[PDB]
UniProtKB/Swiss-Prot annotation:
Gene: NUDT1
Record-given protein name: Oxidized purine nucleoside triphosphate hydrolase
Protein family according to the UniProt entry: Belongs to the Nudix hydrolase family.
The entry's keywords: Cytoplasm, Hydrolase, Magnesium, Metal-binding, Mitochondrion, Nucleus, RNA-binding, Transit peptide
Enzyme class: hydrolase
Organism: Homo sapiens
Effect of S57R: Loss of activity
Domain Nudix hydrolase, residue spans: 3-132
Taxonomic classification: Eukaryota, Metazoa, Chordata, Craniata, Vertebrata
InterPro entries associated with the record: 8ODP, Nudix_hydrolase, NUDIX_hydrolase-like_dom_sf, NUDIX_hydrolase_CS, NUDIX_hydrolase_dom
């Protein structure tokens, strides 16, 4: 049994493009990703996701929808990362670079998988198909998956 810490991840997914951010420092630096971070005390997971989206991309959204949950384990780290994944298609301002992230739109036939976390190759296609999912990935360092599970689910 391991303890887990709550994180969020938000994908702004439109009909033909997705907004990603290049992580400029910290965890996962150098990889394109959705926006997110730790959930803080007192806020719902969805509201923490909205907050991180605003902080890292400048975008303010009224609502998100849950699309998946992914648990990450790292060799040498006792704490699991419990990542709650959300989407929205509906925005009304422009993305702006933050200290954490440089936002960029990608067409949906140009998803930059080689410059994303390796696990994203497995679950991101489900997100694109509008399937909901649960995943688990064990990493050695940043690059190497030692074990993983991925399951489509009816409810996140
Ligand atoms: N796509 C993808 N995202 C991941 C993976 N692992 C992982 O932690 N994430 C996400 C969850 C969070 O959005 C982010 C990690 O949190 P973070 O370090 O940005 O937290 P934060 O913004 O609060 O950190 P900080 O500003 O205090 O430095 O990366 C992964 O394998 N794939
Ligand atoms: Mn953040
Ligand atoms: Mn972050
Ligand atoms: Mn934060």
């Amino acid at each position: 049994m391991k303890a887990s810490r709550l994180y969020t991840l938000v994908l702004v997914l439109q009909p033909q493009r997705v907004l990603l951010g290049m992580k400029k420092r910290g965890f996962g630096a150098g990889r394109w990703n959705g926006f997110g971070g730790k959930v803080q005390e007192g806020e719902t997971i969805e509201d923490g996701a909205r907050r991180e989206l605003q902080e890292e991309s400048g975008l303010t959204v009224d609502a998100l929808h849950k699309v998946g949950q992914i648990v990450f384990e790292f060799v040498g780290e006792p704490e699991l990362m419990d990542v709650h994944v959300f989407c929205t298609d509906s925005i009304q301002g422009t993305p702006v670079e933050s200290d954490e992230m440089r936002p960029c739109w990608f067409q949906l036939d140009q998803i930059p998988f080689k410059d994303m976390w390796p696990d994203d190759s497995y679950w991101f296609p489900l997100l694109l198909q509008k399937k909901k999912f649960h995943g688990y990935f064990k990493f050695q360092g940043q690059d190497t998956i030692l074990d993983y599970t991925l399951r489509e689910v009816d409810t996140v």
